[PDB]
DNA sequence: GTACCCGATGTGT
């Protein structure tokens, strides 16, 4: 149905193009931009799946300028709100916000401006919690609704509705109030990451029963995906070495599971002279802003070692590697966090250090949810299971796994082979370490069993177990994994007399270990 | 037996 929306003959088109050229300073629309903008200006509810950097902002900022009245944009972070409103005001588009960082007097001025006969402000940025606490905001929105000057409700990063609306920031659910208070006002949700289940969840929680859907390919052509086995007490040195070998002059992020993990990573990297800085909620906002500016400018900070708190507002185009020192809580989270790499389209690396012993820590973190119930927990456990299944899948192409998770099917299976420069690890000693480790565990169990049976025989005859078979002979018997006497006599220290005396008890379960 | 342990915002007089 996008053919009807791909038209430059609408009544709003002329003014739209005027603002697009003179106010935004652009020249050509990108993929799905014009269609989504037309659909928005036609009053339709919109759901936009567009990659980061694809141009989501314009899709709601141009209609906000064209439509009469105020467009209310709900954003999850005060940082995102201030950043976007600053960019808009620098572009000379009337926009303002009402968050916890504005003083009461400027808020009163904003309400008075909204109360004027002509509301100059086109974009009003708010948080979900502000909508669920300010009665003054609700009354102002009602005033705007009565004069038909409440344009849009925009949900920027709509996946957050499904990510924290059920158990952390329940106002993201409780904000459904707007659809009851202002049912005729259209809604537009934008996101870069959403599998079909989260898509349906976003649409149901936002009370959007018939949206126009604008989607694109989830493929990230320029990213090479890696997952490596993690040594929990050496991981810092491993990642640091990898960075030094592959990205000595490249900016990067190391995502960590805990605050102490971030501090340990930063300490190691600083101890060997890598400009790495820790970033998590434990730091003050003063220190957080300082480190963020240090990383963005590459001035004394090459790698930032951060928790999931960092990243949502960052638009650095030349991030060449993203390291997850521990596996993330979900595949959606992994896609979003690793996608912070390679916004410029150049080849980048996504390195994930995997252990299930971190899955246990993530399960502990999940069970430590203040407002979690049986269902929300169960959903998080399933997400973690899907992440572990991705980590342990050493057979399927990682791009195919990611695209199947998001429901994109018509994808070329030979992509990783046609363009090997951006190939995942699976498409490139790998599976041999398991073949060696299984044999080593087998010889360990065999040595234990042989030592125990020798101890039993020694207790029977009243001699130390070294006089039946010594340590080295038992170790050599374990390494053989055999049970044929003709080969046992080929082992140094094993004799025919000791065979004729102890063979029934020595072969014992050792004959059952012939499979390795 | 015990230490482990991410992440927002939020006001009319
Ligand atoms: C960093 C990022 N995280 C996400 C992300 C991860 C997981 C979910 C999710 O699974 N949410 C969900 C879905 C359902 S439901 N209705 O689909 O069954 C029910 C319940 C209770 C929850 C919590 C949503 C978003 C995207 S980017
Ligand atoms: N039609 C367009 N043509 C060229 N550049 C554009 C267009 N629309 C937006 N941009 C640019 O893209 C940049 C980022 O857009 P944004 O909407 O933030 O991307 P994302 O959707 O990934 O967040 C902005 O600096 C903007 O100037
Ligand atoms: Zn591949």
Residue numbers in the entry: 640 to 1067, 1201 to 1288
Text taken from the publication that reported this structure:
RECQ helicases catalyse the unwinding of duplex DNA with 3’ to 5’ directionality, driven by energy liberated by ATP-hydrolysis. RECQ-helicases are strongly implicated in the maintenance of genomic integrity, principally through their participation in the homologous recombination (HR) pathway for repair of DNA double-strand breaks and restart of collapsed or blocked replication forks, but also have roles in toleration of microsatellite instability and sister chromatid decatenation. We created the expression construct BLM-HDΔWHD to remove the conformationally flexible Winged Helix domain (WH) that requires the presence of either a stabilising nanobody, or interaction with a large DNA substrate to facilitate crystallogenesis replacing it with a short poly-(glycine/serine) linker that serves to connect the Zinc-binding domain (Zinc) directly to the Helicase and RNAse C-terminal domain (HRDC).
The complex crystallised in space group P1, with six molecules of BLM-HDΔWHD and associated ligands forming the asymmetric unit. The oxygen of the amino group at the centre of the compound is hydrogen-bonded to the side chain of Asn1022, whilst the nitrogen of the same moiety is in hydrogen-bonding distance to both the backbone oxygen and side chain of Ser801. The nitrogen of the sulphonamide group is hydrogen-bonded to the side chain of Asp840, which itself is bonded to the side chain of His805. In our high-resolution crystal structure of BLM-HDΔWHD, we observe the same ‘parked’ interaction for the HRDC, even in the absence of the WHD, but in our liganded structure we see that the HRDC domain swings across the face of the core helicase fold to make a series of polar interactions with the ssDNA-15mer, which is presented on the surface of the D1 domain of a second protomer within the asymmetric unit.
